[PDB]
Amino acid sequence: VDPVALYETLDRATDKGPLRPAQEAVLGDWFKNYVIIKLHTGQGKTLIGLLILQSRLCVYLCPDNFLIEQTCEQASQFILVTSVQKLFNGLILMDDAHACSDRIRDACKIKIPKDEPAYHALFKLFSTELELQGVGTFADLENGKRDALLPVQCIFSGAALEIEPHIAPLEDFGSYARAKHRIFMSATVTDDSFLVKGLQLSPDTISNPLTYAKETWSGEKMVLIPSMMHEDLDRAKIVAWLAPVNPKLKFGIVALVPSFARNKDWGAYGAKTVDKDSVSEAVSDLKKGQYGTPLVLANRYDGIDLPDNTCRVLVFDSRPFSENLTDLYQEHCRPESEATLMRTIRSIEQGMGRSVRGEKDYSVVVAIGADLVRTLRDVSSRRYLSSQMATQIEIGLEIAEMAREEIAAGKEPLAALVGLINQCLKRDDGWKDFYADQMKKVAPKGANKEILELYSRELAAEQAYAAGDYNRAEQTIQKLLDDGLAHPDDRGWYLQERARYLHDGNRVEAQKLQVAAHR
Amino acid sequence: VDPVALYETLDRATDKGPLRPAQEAVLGDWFKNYGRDVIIKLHTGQGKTLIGLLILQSRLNDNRRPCVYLCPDNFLIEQTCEQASQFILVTSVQKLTILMDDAHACSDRIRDACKIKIPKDEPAYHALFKLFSTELELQGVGTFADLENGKRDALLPVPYWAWMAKEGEVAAILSAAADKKSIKFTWPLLKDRLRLCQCIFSGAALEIEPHIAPLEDFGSYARAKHRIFMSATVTDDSFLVKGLQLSPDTISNPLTYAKETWSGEKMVLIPSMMHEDLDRAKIVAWLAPVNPKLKFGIVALVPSFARNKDWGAYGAKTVDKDSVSEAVSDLKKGQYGTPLVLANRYDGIDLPDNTCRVLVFDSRPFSENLTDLYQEHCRPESEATLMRTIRSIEQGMGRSVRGEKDYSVVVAIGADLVRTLRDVSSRRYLSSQMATQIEIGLEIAEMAREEIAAGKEPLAALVGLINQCLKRDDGWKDFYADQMKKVAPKGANKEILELYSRELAAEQAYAAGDYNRAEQTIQKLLDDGLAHPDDRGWYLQERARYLHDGNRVEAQKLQVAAHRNNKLLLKPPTGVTVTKLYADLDATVSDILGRLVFGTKAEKFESALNELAFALGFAGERPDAEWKEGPDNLWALNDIQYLLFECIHKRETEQMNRSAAWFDKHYLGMKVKRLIVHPANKIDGM
């Protein structure tokens, strides 16, 4: 049942030709051998997925329900697909593996808020581990605010009662771990080094992505970082520019924004401030040419398809801070740690994977905020980023250089920004060929072996602490520091991690470690 | 610029893959060569829109411009260049360096646009009727009265000698009618090229047409710098020589894909060769009333505007070639309750995927052109007649597919396609694809007979076979997947090309005034022995036809000899004197039985009432069509006994008087039984 040849048995629509060359190859390499099918989206990952889920003659998986009833239509234009909220139980394929890692993370955080009565039983019951330290800062959480940590496995914070381990406990999804092996998919822009934290699977075959030999470069992403062109284009200007209704544009806007408070900046101009399934409405009307109203989504940097003129402009408004509070509290506590940089970058990259879904596609991405700049400027963070991303980012940086040249030539920053968006929109060949020259810097890479190993140790520390063998966690962090894998601040923070692993043991050693970290 | 590499520079929509293997091979073959004329064939969905546009883009960017694809109709001007959004100049053929699609369809829109048709309502009919009132009578004393009484399909020519003798009077009468919708579009052409043409009368319309469509007159296509007449692999490309003015070379070197065998699916049905309880009288009872179950479009194709009545009475949506532009779009929406009905739409509609999974093909496409009916009268069995009817079969089934894994149910039901698709000689005039697809259609028809032999309802057997193509049946798919291995595309038979090219050159020679060079070319053809002896008489008429402009004595002797070979030809006013007169048998009698029914179209009725003599073994003639006076039908029952038939109101009483006087004049005192064509029996009628 061979997925390179037997594709010619599909009584496909008149609009459907052969396979891509890359599909011919990757289907063959799957077939001869059988993991991350890194390909530029628009190499027909839908078709690759459905042809593996034909060669299994066993089902798809995807972020969340809104798209999946739509995506099954290609089993009509060319076993039944299903979303990931189903089929698993606690006791093949997947798609957009980091984008769906957030959905499978939020399904771990079954928090319940403090106005539901269960907290008032929880707060006194759990008190024996937290009251001994927390009363020094009981202030925000006495009023129900979320801004305070509770100094108690799972984390606890001043907001809701919160079943949230540091790693997402997605192991409570059973058959995910049990099948012989299962293919993923992921755009080549993905930093798949995060998978061992985002999806827990182990470093080895994650380091060998299935890849066409000539797999190279794709997606005309004009990734504007206008926070490195001028402060006249700092974040507040774009909201007050692209949020109004403007049906005179021939393509969709969308905006991706960090919090439900900032819906009051975009929505001040009447944008369609949807929720996590009414997005279907504004995306479908943007397909149906209703280019009038910018769709806007809070804290959903992921799991949206916007092929071709459905979006030539995505506004990536600000540096993400998660739907989950532990991932936020660590941003305060570990401000230049590897964990914080990779956790942010894994979203910064995924928050650009929406507005391109074709191989020859073109797209403005505007990604803005000086804190986002602080996260993307560092060469170490472009080391975390994929080399396709690192190149596309650096091309974005060169466009910001040309934009600063234009402004130095006296061009008003918003009129230069309109000009730049004109270049990508109107297929300006002097821009397209410039971009084609610049793309020769692209080459693919495997997952980063430096980091998969450290994260397997950190992950193993979490599981050993969970498996009743805190001693093996002590050995893991000792071995980690002896190998020198920690960043200079983590050389302090790991004493607090060790202490958290040891507060169930001899209380005094962990206490001395915390005192040694507290400074 | 290079069409091998150009494809990957396309800003193509996310739903579009790479360049196909067939397209890339064929575009190597184009680019390593032509980058003036060459045919192509390429199966539907091999992307002839895509191929056509990589070529026309390729030409447009090396500044060799303008160059244009033709859509076979006005409907498609949007549906084609939509794929300049999904991936330039384009236009409908009725609006006109031109690199075709759908070669026979684009031929025919170039012919029917170049053909006068004047209906009985307008004085333009009656003034010409007054003009030719003597010579039409002297070509059918009987039939000349059925024009004023006005049966739709009584049919008379005006002879070449009549036409040339009254040239300026016709030109004056119809210049005085140059504004009418019956005349307006054709008029800049045939008002000048009079003598090359012929003119034919019927009791509902009259027509005027040249024997070769006047391509050289065109503003653009006549002066083209390159062409490539792409067509579906279904087409027998042999007909394009005269319709599109090819060399034999151009058609002889087609750029098909080097490893092509078969692609595209048509479940061609011939229900009239399954059972008579499945011929057109059965299929009448089922298809057009509204049905709730259907998930796919249905289009009824009928030969002419008068044939709408049955499906319209059952209630299918009787749109026309203009108003179809709505319903064909609502077939994409979901209008599946009510089928369309289209008259004479064997060409120019493209119905991809579920826009049509069922198409009905009612009857043998006797043209919107009287010229082809009267050449079916002059030459009922010639190569030209068999080609011009077989070609319309080969086009009509090509409506309901435009992909390669696309699929379709062309239901072709005619009682005369019985006496059309059977003959292997007639199936010479097909591509190897279309010939094989038709033969698989007859084996499929036999399998429907086997279902009826399993006692199943014949219509339900059709609904079953419909299911076997709707639901991608393992049976039909593997049955086809076994049988089509026999095929690769043909070139063309040089014997046909050379014959047809000499026919063309004879017309062009007479247009040059070299009537003698045309005449010699015809004699040369007969000395090469290619034409069957029954076509020889038409060629003697062809010799005489041009010679009448200046060598009337030999032309008259030739016309006498033409009449001696085949009497249904034109007969001169002087010199000629009246001389004294199992399944394939089932099919041919069924074509006779299908026409002899009382009140049928008169030409069909009379022709069946002549052929019925030979089906009964008598020697038959049509004196009103042969001797041009006297009875419409006359048989010798033996050399002393005869049988006679004649076409109740006042005016019809003249006919039996004249035909009696003719018979008593030429066949003096011979014994006869005399009949009149009426079912009425008071004022034998049989």
Structure tokens at A381: 């963070």
- B8: how many CB neighbours lie within 10 A of its CB? 11
Structure tokens at B485: 């291995």
Distance CA A298, CA A254 (A): 11
Please choose, from the candidates B242, B266, B116, the residue with its C-alpha nearest in 3D space to the C-alpha of residue B182: B116
- CB B403 to CB A13 under 8 A? yes
Task: Output the CA–CA distances (angstroms, integers) from residue B639 to B613, B634, B635, B673, in the order listed.
Answer: 14, 13, 10, 14
**Which residues in chain B are closer than 8 Å to A16, comparing Cβ atoms?**
17, 405
Question: Which residues, at least 6 apart from A31, have a Cβ–Cβ distance to it below 8 Å?
Answer: A2, A3, A4, A55
Distance CA A193, CA A455 (A): 9
Please choose, from the candidates B337, B339, B332, the residue with its C-alpha nearest in 3D space to the C-alpha of residue B354: B332
Query: HSE on the CB side for B294, CA within 13 Å?
Result: 25
Distance CA B158, CA B132 (A): 7
| Number of alpha helices (DSSP H) and beta strands (DSSP E) in chain A | 23, 8
Task: Tell me the one-letter amino acid at B44.
Answer: T
Query: A303 with A242: CB under 8 angstroms?
Result: no
Q: In this complex, which of A10, A14, A362 lies closest to B352 when CB atoms are compared? A: A14
Q: Is B264 on the interface with A (CB under 8 A)?
A: no
Q: Cis bond leading into B157, ω under 30°?
A: no
B119, β-bridge pairs = B205
Q: Testing the interface with A: which of B23, B61, B405, B471 to mutate, by most A Cβ within 10 A? A: B405
Q: Is A74 on the interface with B (CB under 8 A)?
A: no
- CB B47 to CB A20 under 8 A? no
Token match 């009656």: residue? B126
Q: In this complex, which of A11, A19, A307 lies closest to B472 when CB atoms are compared? A: A11
- CB B403 to CB A14 under 8 A? yes
Q: Cis bond leading into B631, ω under 30°?
A: no
Distance CA A87, CA B27 (A): 49
Query: B293 with B467: CB under 8 angstroms?
Result: no
Beta strands in B557-640 (DSSP E): 619-621, 633-636
Task: Tell me the one-letter amino acid at B86.
Answer: Q
**Which residues in chain A are closer than 8 Å to B16, comparing Cβ atoms?**
15, 17
Q: In this complex, which of B17, B403, B407 lies closest to A18 when CB atoms are compared? A: B17
Q: In this structure, what DSSP letter does residue A159 have?
A: S
Instruction: Calculate how close chain B gets to A15, using CA atoms only, in Å.
Output: 8
- A46: how many CB neighbours lie within 10 A of its CB? 21
Those of residues 125-164 in A touching chain B at CB distance below 8 A are: none
Question: Which residues, at least 6 apart from A50, have a Cβ–Cβ distance to it below 8 Å?
Answer: A60, A74, A75, A78
Structure tokens at A234: 């700092």
Distance CA B601, CA B112 (A): 22
Please provide the size of chain B in residues.
686
Token match 């960017």: residue? B61
A155-178 in b/e form (b: 16+ CB < 10 A) is bbbbbbbbebebbbbbeebeebee
Distance CA B611, CA B380 (A): 11
Query: A152 with A129: CB under 8 angstroms?
Result: yes
SS3 (DSSP) at A138: coil
Q: Is A174 on the interface with B (CB under 8 A)?
A: no
First to last CA, chain B: 72
Question: Which residues, at least 6 apart from A242, have a Cβ–Cβ distance to it below 8 Å?
Answer: A253, A255, A294, A313, A315
A447-473 in b/e form (b: 16+ CB < 10 A) is bbeebbbbbbbbbebbbbbeeeebeeb
Distance CA B423, CA B440 (A): 15
Structure tokens at A95: 């798609």
The string of DSSP codes covering B443-471 is HHHHHHHHHHHTT--HHHHHHHHHHHHHT
Please choose, from the candidates B654, B647, B652, B649, the residue with its C-alpha nearest in 3D space to the C-alpha of residue B675: B647
With vertex at residue A91, the alpha carbon angle to CA A88 and CA A94, rounded to the nearest 5 degrees, is: 25
- CB A14 to CB B407 under 8 A? no
Instruction: Calculate how close chain A gets to B8, using CA atoms only, in Å.
Output: 9
Q: Testing the interface with A: which of B7, B8, B15 to mutate, by most A Cβ within 10 A? A: B15
Distance CA B469, CA B357 (A): 8
The string of DSSP codes covering A305-328 is ---GGG-SEEEE-S----SSSHHH
Task: Tell me the one-letter amino acid at B219.
Answer: G
Task: Output the CA–CA distances (angstroms, integers) from residue A214 to A22, A218, B268, in the order listed.
Answer: 8, 12, 44
Distance CA B642, CA B630 (A): 14
Phi-psi category of residue A468: left, alpha or beta, with phi > 0 → left and psi -120 to 50 → alpha: left
Distance CA B340, CA B362 (A): 13
Task: Tell me the one-letter amino acid at A465.
Answer: Y
Query: HSE on the CB side for B96, CA within 13 Å?
Result: 23
Q: In this complex, which of B12, B21, B352 lies closest to A360 when CB atoms are compared? A: B12
Instruction: Calculate how close chain A gets to B77, using CA atoms only, in Å.
Output: 18
Q: In this structure, what DSSP letter does residue B278 have?
A: G
Can you give the C-alpha Rg of chain B in angstroms? 26
Structure tokens at A154: 């799972």
**Which residues in chain A are closer than 8 Å to B17, comparing Cβ atoms?**
16-20, 44
Query: B95 with B162: CB under 8 angstroms?
Result: no
Query: B345 with B302: CB under 8 angstroms?
Result: no
Question: Which residues, at least 6 apart from A354, have a Cβ–Cβ distance to it below 8 Å?
Answer: A254, A256, A302, A304, A305, A306, A311, A314
Instruction: Calculate how close chain B gets to A16, using CA atoms only, in Å.
Output: 7
Task: Tell me the one-letter amino acid at A250.
Answer: K
Question: Which residues, at least 6 apart from B494, have a Cβ–Cβ distance to it below 8 Å?
Answer: B248, B252
Q: Is A216 on the interface with B (CB under 8 A)?
A: no
Q: Is A15 on the interface with B (CB under 8 A)?
A: yes
Question: Which residues, at least 6 apart from B88, have a Cβ–Cβ distance to it below 8 Å?
Answer: B53, B56, B57, B60, B81
Token match 């041919």: residue? B588
Query: B283 with B360: CB under 8 angstroms?
Result: yes
Distance CA B29, CA A200 (A): 53
Distance CA A280, CA A310 (A): 12
Q: Is A17 on the interface with B (CB under 8 A)?
A: yes
Q: In this complex, which of A12, A16, A358 lies closest to B14 when CB atoms are compared? A: A358
Please choose, from the candidates B611, B528, B621, the residue with its C-alpha nearest in 3D space to the C-alpha of residue B579: B621
Task: Output the CA–CA distances (angstroms, integers) from residue A336 to A98, A198, B301, in the order listed.
Answer: 22, 20, 75
First to last CA, chain A: 63
Please provide the size of chain A in residues.
519
Distance CA A496, CA B266 (A): 74
The string of DSSP codes covering B350-371 is ---GGG-SEEEE-S----S-HH
Chain centroid, CA B397 distance in Å:
13
Instruction: Calculate how close chain A gets to B352, using CA atoms only, in Å.
Output: 7
- CB A14 to CB B402 under 8 A? yes
Distance CA A279, CA A265 (A): 18
Q: Is B485 exposed, middle or buried (0-12, 13-18, 19+ CB in 10 A)?
A: exposed
Query: A157 with A326: CB under 8 angstroms?
Result: yes
Distance CA A358, CA B671 (A): 88
Please choose, from the candidates A295, A291, A273, A292, the residue with its C-alpha nearest in 3D space to the C-alpha of residue A282: A295
Instruction: Calculate how close chain A gets to B63, using CA atoms only, in Å.
Output: 18
Q: Is A76 on the interface with B (CB under 8 A)?
A: no
Structure tokens at B483: 């049988």
Query: A180 with A343: CB under 8 angstroms?
Result: no
Q: What are residue B595's phi and psi, to 5 degrees? A: -125, -30
Distance CA A36, CA A198 (A): 13
Token match 């409405």: residue? A281
Query: B134 with B169: CB under 8 angstroms?
Result: no
Beta strands in B515-647 (DSSP E): 619-621, 633-636, 641-646
Chain centroid, CA B366 distance in Å:
6
- CB B14 to CB A362 under 8 A? no
Distance CA A131, CA B395 (A): 88
- CB A21 to CB B18 under 8 A? yes
Domains and CATH numbers, chain A: 6-105+169-206 (3.40.50.300), 110-163 (no CATH), 220-441 (3.40.50), 468-518 (no CATH)
**Which residues in chain B are closer than 8 Å to A44, comparing Cβ atoms?**
17
Distance CA B442, CA B452 (A): 15
SS3 (DSSP) at A367: strand
Q: Is A287 on the interface with B (CB under 8 A)?
A: no
The string of DSSP codes covering B459-504 is HHHHHHHHHHHHT--HHHHHHHHHHGGG-------HHHHHHHHHHH
B68, β-bridge pairs = B98
Q: In this structure, what DSSP letter does residue B82 have?
A: G
Q: Is A484 on the interface with B (CB under 8 A)?
A: no
Q: Is A437 on the interface with B (CB under 8 A)?
A: no
Distance CA B327, CA B336 (A): 10
Query: B40 with B46: CB under 8 angstroms?
Result: no
Please choose, from the candidates B236, B183, B184, B243, the residue with its C-alpha nearest in 3D space to the C-alpha of residue B211: B243
**Which residues in chain B are closer than 8 Å to A4, comparing Cβ atoms?**
none
Distance CA A294, CA A254 (A): 5
- CB A18 to CB B14 under 8 A? no
Beta strand pairing call for B90-92 and B116-119: unpaired
Q: In this structure, what DSSP letter does residue B260 have?
A: -
**Which residues in chain B are closer than 8 Å to A74, comparing Cβ atoms?**
none
- B178: how many CB neighbours lie within 10 A of its CB? 12
Please choose, from the candidates B669, B13, B577, the residue with its C-alpha nearest in 3D space to the C-alpha of residue A16: B13
**Which residues in chain A are closer than 8 Å to B402, comparing Cβ atoms?**
14
Preceding-residue numbers of gaps in chain A (C–N over 2.5 Å): 34, 57, 78, 91, 152
SS3 (DSSP) at B30: helix
Task: Output the CA–CA distances (angstroms, integers) from residue B529 to B500, B520, B536, in the order listed.
Answer: 14, 14, 10
- CB A44 to CB B20 under 8 A? no
Query: B153 with B203: CB under 8 angstroms?
Result: yes
Distance CA B101, CA B68 (A): 10
DSSP alpha helix (H) spans, A255-386: 263-266, 279-287, 326-333, 338-350, 370-376, 379-384
Question: Which residues, at least 6 apart from B584, have a Cβ–Cβ distance to it below 8 Å?
Answer: B422
- CB B11 to CB A308 under 8 A? no
SS3 (DSSP) at B74: coil
DSSP alpha helix (H) spans, A72-189: 74-77, 99-106, 118-125, 127-134
- B381: how many CB neighbours lie within 10 A of its CB? 10
- CB B407 to CB A11 under 8 A? yes
Q: Testing the interface with B: which of A4, A6, A9, A11 to mutate, by most B Cβ within 10 A? A: A11
Q: Is A12 on the interface with B (CB under 8 A)?
A: yes
- CB A14 to CB B406 under 8 A? yes
Distance CA B679, CA B600 (A): 12
Structure tokens at A489: 């601040």
Distance CA B91, CA B85 (A): 16
Distance CA A229, CA A475 (A): 48
Query: A103 with A84: CB under 8 angstroms?
Result: yes
Q: In this structure, what DSSP letter does residue B425 have?
A: T
Structure tokens at B362: 């009612």
Distance CA A501, CA A462 (A): 9
SS3 (DSSP) at B116: strand
Can you give the C-alpha Rg of chain A in angstroms? 24
Please choose, from the candidates B160, B114, B259, the residue with its C-alpha nearest in 3D space to the C-alpha of residue B569: B160
Please choose, from the candidates A1, A69, A16, the residue with its C-alpha nearest in 3D space to the C-alpha of residue A47: A16
Distance CA B662, CA A329 (A): 116
SS3 (DSSP) at B8: helix
Q: Is B14 on the interface with A (CB under 8 A)?
A: yes
Structure tokens at B223: 């002066």
**Which residues in chain A are closer than 8 Å to B45, comparing Cβ atoms?**
14
**Which residues in chain B are closer than 8 Å to A360, comparing Cβ atoms?**
10-12
Task: Output the CA–CA distances (angstroms, integers) from residue A37 to A10, A387, B83, in the order listed.
Answer: 22, 16, 31
- CB B17 to CB A44 under 8 A? yes
Distance CA B28, CA B6 (A): 12
DSSP alpha helix (H) spans, B62-186: 76-81, 103-111, 123-131, 133-137, 143-149, 160-165, 167-175
Task: Tell me the one-letter amino acid at B232.
Answer: A
Distance CA B315, CA B309 (A): 9
Q: In this complex, which of A18, A357, A360 lies closest to B11 when CB atoms are compared? A: A360
Counting one residue from chain A and one from chain B, the pairs whose CB atoms sit within 8 A come to: 51
| Farthest CA pair distance, chain B | 87
Distance CA B147, CA B124 (A): 14
Describe the crossing of helices B533-547 and B515-528 by its angle, rounded to 10 degrees. 170
